């Protein structure tokens, strides 16, 4: 109310822990007790791209400017 | 200082008047210079004695 800051009563709002596998996370959370919500790891998708099908003959893939 | 604007933030004419030194200045003060991993140690002869830092 005097300075305009983020006055918070949260000691545990500024922690982040770096793990290697999900098993280490589960073992750590059950070791130190409090509840956990584990999201699933969502990798990228290896997608096929090709310059010839980019610039083919009778397909609809035609950039028309480059 | 050293001949590396990736570690030492370079002087003012090249810092201003130059693009690369401005970029290295900026990201050097924001991110901090990258450090290769490892566990090292040294010790000097401080006037109290073996000043060690690990």
């Amino acid at each position: 109310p005097l300075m305009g800051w983020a006055s918070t009563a949260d000691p545990l709002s500024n922690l982040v822990l770096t793990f290697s596998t999900k098993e280490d996370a589960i073992a750590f959370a059950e070791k130190n007790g409090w509840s956990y919500d584990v999201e699933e790891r969502k990798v990228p998708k290896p997608k096929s791209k090709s310059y010839g099908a980019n610039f083919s003959w009778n397909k609809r893939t035609r950039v028309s400017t480059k | 200082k050293v001949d590396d604007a990736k570690v030492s933030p370079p002087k003012r004419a090249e810092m201003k008047t130059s693009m690369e030194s401005l970029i290295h200045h900026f990201k050097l003060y924001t991110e901090g210079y990258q450090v290769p991993p490892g566990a090292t140690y040294t010790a000097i002869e401080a006037p109290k004695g073996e000043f060690g830092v690990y």
């Binding site: 003959w57 009778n58 028309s64 400017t65 | -």
Partner: protein, 212 residues
């Protein structure tokens, strides 16, 4: 330079633009050369026809082309800005292009530029407050063995000198368009001195053929 449109009427559609139905038949020949699937490949000849029909192209010419050729208009803007023929800005009826880069300037283009400058009065890269004498200097045209050379619209002028510069300019000021051929000898690509190239009338189909 100045690739913002800066609308300023004489532009800003609707500006009235039209062709000839005879020119529509030309356009039918133009998209009759090209195969099916690539109807948009005739952007370059149709916009060449647009520069042939109007000495500089306005925005509504490009709008009419975007209507006709089933094209997005931005590609028409790209091709209009991209190349060198399509002077989107108004010039004279005749347009003067002084070709001078590597052989032409090395063979004394200075006197040519002097004669053009103190004969016409207006400066390089600029216009004149009348028609048919708007000037830019330009890159190579191909006819490099000749003098630093002059181009007007669909015509060349080769192997000149500042007095012939002034004479051809005076003939254009009178409106009498000069000869398309060069001046001062070598009407063709001739060795203008000894002419040590082929002289005999050739054999033709006479010489020895193999496995007829």
């Amino acid at each position: 330079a100045l690739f913002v449109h800066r609308d300023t009427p004489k532009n800003n559609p609707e500006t009235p633009f039209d062709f000839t139905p005879e020119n529509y038949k030309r356009i039918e020949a133009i998209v009759k050369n090209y195969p099916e699937g690539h109807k948009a490949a005739a952007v370059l000849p149709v916009l060449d026809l647009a520069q042939r029909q109007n000495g500089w192209l306005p925005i509504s010419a490009m709008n009419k082309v975007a209507e006709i050729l089933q094209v997005p208009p931005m590609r028409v803007y790209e091709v209009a800005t991209f190349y060198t023929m399509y002077n989107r800005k108004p010039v004279g009826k005749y347009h003067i292009q002084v070709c001078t880069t590597t052989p032409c300037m090395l063979r004394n283009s200075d006197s040519i530029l002097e004669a053009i400058q103190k004969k016409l009065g207006i400066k390089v890269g600029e216009t004149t407050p009348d028609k048919l004498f708007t000037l830019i200097e330009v890159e190579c045209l191909g006819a490099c063995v000749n003098a630093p050379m002059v181009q007007i619209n669909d015509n060349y002028y080769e192997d000149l000198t500042p007095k012939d510069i002034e004479e051809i300019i005076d003939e254009l000021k009178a409106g009498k368009i000069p000869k398309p051929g060069p001046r001062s000898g070598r009407f063709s690509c001739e060795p203008a001195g000894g002419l040590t190239s082929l002289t005999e009338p050739p054999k033709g189909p006479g010489f020895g053929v193999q496995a007829g």
